[PDB]
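R699
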Amino acid sequence: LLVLGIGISVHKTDGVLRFEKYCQAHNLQYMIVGEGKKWNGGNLESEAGGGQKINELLIALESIKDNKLIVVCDTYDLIPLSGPEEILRKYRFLTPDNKVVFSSELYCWPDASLVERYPKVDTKYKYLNSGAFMGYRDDIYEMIKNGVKDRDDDQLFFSIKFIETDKIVLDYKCELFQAMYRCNSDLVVHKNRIFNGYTNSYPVFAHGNGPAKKLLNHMEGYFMTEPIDGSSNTINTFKLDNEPKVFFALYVDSNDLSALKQFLGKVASIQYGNKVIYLYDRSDNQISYPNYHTGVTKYVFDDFKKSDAQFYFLLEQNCIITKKDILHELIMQVKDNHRVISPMIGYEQNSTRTNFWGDIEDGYYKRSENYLDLAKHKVRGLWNVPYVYGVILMHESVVRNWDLSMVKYNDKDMDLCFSLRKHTIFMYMINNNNYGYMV
Ligand SMILES: O=c1ccn([C@@H]2O[C@H](COP(=O)(O)OP(=O)(O)O)[C@@H](O)[C@H]2O)c(=O)[nH]1
Ligand SMILES: [Mn+2]
């Protein structure tokens, strides 16, 4: 068995890094198709496309000469939750005649007229989703061998193949694949898996297709790729052996002189040797802070890019850090798909108002099911969330390679988070300790 995940990008997203980590945890051999190449498959958000996925898959298949079983899948919004033995057993059971199995889903798209051409079935999971499929290398090769246009629609291509041929079967019972979109009430997390209570199955591949990225990101916080080490926090005093260089980017407003002094005093007490400090002041109105810049109304990345710093540590004036070893603690969490980390702090006079959002609806705050549990530390860890504010540690691989300056909301903190979401760079809130408060 080989898993061919489509990851066409010059630099890796957190989606692909997460997919790789889940593949490794489940002993799945995999190739990232299209790694290092520029995406030309279209703006999938506002328009369909994805033909380039087919063309890159075809090139990859030229390296795989034997007729082996292959899974072909999305990577940005998809993870495996089990290993090759379960996959092979399910495949054999689903298709004794070794057909290509595609994911099912709730909706018939992009061509509504196909509704009446699909086989009639006694399930809501009626239609093809082209985001995950499995079959023999030669069968898949035969379907795609003439290539397509980069901007052709791969969803439509495979829908037509299903309807018109006998080469494809759909995974109606969600055994191998789960298209999660609008199936929230079917699904629970149990024993490190998704359980679909509608189908009575444990789907191997969890696909947060469309807006269900939010749901998969949510469930991620409850899954494991390795056991918790319960002793990681037993001493809450963290010290790095060798300190990477951290660029402190302080967003200040000297108009509020007393708030500024108090903030700078706390920042000066963060224990870290290898650093450079820049002050970015909103006011137009300094001996202790040579790198001082005035009239700044946006987040600034160019000074960091020109530096040799390994991390960018964004701190806003209204966030008061009290945990002196916090930078050591945060850096220890930066690995794999965990590259943007924000410690959870609450407002001093009502700690349920924090510096993250658990959910988002049309770009605005929505209360997630576990929001209050995180804010009150009923459960702790790292959580993939749509917005973080005020204290953000970002690895250089993010800041040096991605446009963090995209504009939607005309608000610096909201637009930074929009930028990251758009690039499939994840924001992780961490609430393992008491870090501070907001004013
Ligand atoms: O720059 C890009 C954009 C997308 N994709 C791949 O195309 C898939 C389809 O996009 P998406 O999952 O967002 O589509 P959806 O499942 O929401 O229709 C992604 O998961 C990736 O595997 C890629 O490789 N590079
Ligand atoms: Mn997808």
